[PDB]
Amino acid sequence: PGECSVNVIPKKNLDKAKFFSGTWYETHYLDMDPQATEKFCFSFAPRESGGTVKEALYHFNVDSKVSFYNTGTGPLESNGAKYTAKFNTVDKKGKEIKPADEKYSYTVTVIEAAKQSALIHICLQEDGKDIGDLYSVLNRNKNALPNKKIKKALNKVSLVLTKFVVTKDLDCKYDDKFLSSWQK
Point out the annotated binding site: 31, 59, 70, 133
Nearest CB to ligand HEM, comparing residues 82 and 151: 82
3-state secondary structure 38-59: CCEEEEEEEEEECCEEEEEEEE
Minimum gap (Å) between residue 123 Cβ and ligand HEM: 10
Residues in contact with ligand HEM by CB under 6 A are 26, 29, 38, 40, 42, 44, 57, 59, 70, 72, 87, 106, 108, 120, 122, 134, 136
Minimum gap (Å) between residue 85 Cβ and ligand HEM: 7
Minimum gap (Å) between residue 81 Cβ and ligand HEM: 13
Instruction: Say if CB 79 and CB 10 are below 8 A apart.
Output: yes
In angstroms, rounded to a whole number, what is the distance separating the alpha carbons of residues 62 and 64? 6
Nearest CB to ligand HEM, comparing residues 19 and 106: 106
Which residues does 91 contact at the CB level (< 8 Å), separation at least 6? 69, 97
Maximum distance among all Cα pairs of the chain, rounded to whole angstroms: 41
Of 23, 39, 21, 58, the C-alpha closest to 168 is: 39
Minimum gap (Å) between residue 97 Cβ and ligand HEM: 12
